[PDB]
Copies of this chain bind each other. A is one copy, B any other.
């Protein structure tokens, strides 16, 4: 298969990389493994002005004060268990957020701070009949209220929560209180069930105390029950938050209607739904195994027909030292990362089930050495019923000597593996910055992007609305509006000239600058930088962007186009003149 993309040839798949604790999303071409684009999200991007513009800061809301993010789990919206390519969602563990990226423009359009929780980690989307909810794990246990009166993790009100978000409105939909904590999560192929791993059933704070008892669990949710109760008004609220909260904790050994707890060894990590939709598969981490829950048997468990929690475990294969995550070729094989053994193991699921039932069958097919310490892995289309079994990417955390030395801080090794035949084969070592955790691949024909902006696009619709209240036609106008100590500059730009090449303000004015790029030709991007004022933004064809800063320095202040747009780019400039105190 494939491997090389030469000049003039295009990649076959889009890859979407989490940027880890750097905070952006990266778009790659597969199988080239080249970075086609970065999409700023939780990071401040000096290039495009994400974090600086009024459009981005409005999207970010109050959290625009944060300059950091820690994002792990990128996922694409689905319709009937197949990517629809409309949105990508990603977590922020550092500042408790979920972001939405529109895949038609490759920008983040919505962001939410998840209320009453700490650290949003695991995240996956509802598969069937479409992505109605985004499900997100809050990883750390906290007091409720968290007012500094209680610090102890054991209080009746010290807990973490599972989170559902309307994928379309990006509002909170509901939250479910749970025993222990939450690591990773996945959803079934019906919409009824979701599931999550827990590694802190002990509720300790030290290393040894989290590794305490030989088993934790995966908690299985009945979204249908949860939906029913919310619409039956049976919910509580926490603090000033209107979010419906339902209780998924076990009372005195009795179950809530919303949850079930399936014991799993040992500090389990990855939580993955097979492409055939037969299994939730939990990676054992400290246990050298994975754990297979039959989704089949979940209706009987919730209905009380099953004698005991462990009954839904139809497989528990022994695999190797330090299992972290599982993915699927859609051929009936599963692929699991072993962190300690530094391998990917390929294994047959149905054979694992039968071996848990007595039959002595060798369910392991192959172990491939990786370099080194793999975390996540992802097979192409693995999260859909179209799992095509062509490509595998394992994302290792130590690169050691796989690339040229670049100092004490090392890159990550993301390795492309061909799985289209019977033997896994390593084809490409891909260095990446700041620890991507997971990634997702889509077919090229599953993504459809806009070549230039629509004037009516929601992204800057608020800026269009404000322009109205000044009597500005953004498509045509080059005006300066004065309002007390607020100066609002409106201009069109067309390579190689700004529509407004000079304005004059008085010292201390609040200057907003709105730019509308009216070039027709694709790729004709402009920038705008105000020298020595900390101001920078992109404006792409037919886009409107706006930025606001204080003219606190008297004298002549130059602004220049940052994006190379024309032969006369260097001369694409203007002057802001600031009248003294």
On whether the beta carbons of B106 and A407 are closer than 8 Å, the reply is yes
Chosen A-B contacts, 7 in total, with CB atoms closer than 8 Å, are: A21-B46, A21-B527, A47-B434, A140-B558, A148-B507, A199-B570, A285-B567
Partner of A34, one of B94, B373, B430: B430
CB distance from A10 to the nearest CB of B (A): 6
Given known A339-B567, A567-B285, A570-B183, contact A27–B525 (CB-CB < 8 A): no
On whether the beta carbons of A21 and B531 are closer than 8 Å, the reply is no
A2 within 8 A of B: no
CB distance from A290 to the nearest CB of B (A): 16
On whether the beta carbons of B37 and A407 are closer than 8 Å, the reply is yes
Given known A94-B531, A555-B146, contact A37–B449 (CB-CB < 8 A): no
Of the listed residues A107, A402, A407, A534, the one surrounded by the most CB atoms of chain B closer than 10 A to its CB is A407
Copy number in this complex?
A: 2
Complex: chain B residue closest to A569, CB-CB:
B397
CB distance from A323 to the nearest CB of B (A): 11
Which residues from 513 to 565 on chain A have a C-beta closer than 8 Å to any C-beta of chain B?
522-523, 525, 527, 529, 531-532, 534-536, 538, 540-543, 553-558, 560, 562-565
In the assembled complex, which residues on chain B have CB atoms less than 8 Å from the CB atom of A398?
Answer: 523
Given known A43-B46, A435-B563, A525-B409, contact A148–B534 (CB-CB < 8 A): no
6 closest A-B pairs (Cβ-Cβ)? A148-B554, A146-B555, A106-B407, A47-B434, A148-B580, A46-B68
Complex: chain B residue closest to A403, CB-CB:
B36
Partner of A564, one of B29, B375, B402, B432: B375
**Given pairs A23-B46, A404-B444, 18 additional interface contacts (CB within 8 A):** A8-B402, A10-B404, A21-B562, A36-B406, A36-B431, A37-B431, A65-B534, A67-B67, A96-B531, A105-B407, A118-B532, A142-B556, A142-B558, A151-B555, A199-B571, A210-B571, A267-B568, A286-B567
On whether the beta carbons of B37 and A22 are closer than 8 Å, the reply is no
A496 within 8 A of B: yes
In the assembled complex, which residues on chain B have CB atoms less than 8 Å from the CB atom of A170?
Answer: none
Which residues from 23 to 60 on chain A have a C-beta closer than 8 Å to any C-beta of chain B?
23, 27, 29, 33-38, 42-49, 51-52
CB distance from A139 to the nearest CB of B (A): 8
Given known A322-B567, A408-B452, A555-B148, contact A7–B427 (CB-CB < 8 A): yes
CB distance from A578 to the nearest CB of B (A): 6
A357 within 8 A of B: no
On whether the beta carbons of A407 and B536 are closer than 8 Å, the reply is no
Partner of A151, one of B402, B543, B553, B556: B556
Q: Mark A399-413, 1 if CB is under 8 A from B, else 0.
A: 110111111111100
In the assembled complex, which residues on chain B have CB atoms less than 8 Å from the CB atom of A371?
Answer: 7
On whether the beta carbons of B48 and A95 are closer than 8 Å, the reply is no
Q: Mark A435-472, 1 if CB is under 8 A from B, else 0.
A: 10100000010000111110000000000000000000
Q: Mark A250-294, 1 if CB is under 8 A from B, else 0.
A: 000000000000000001010000000000000001100000000
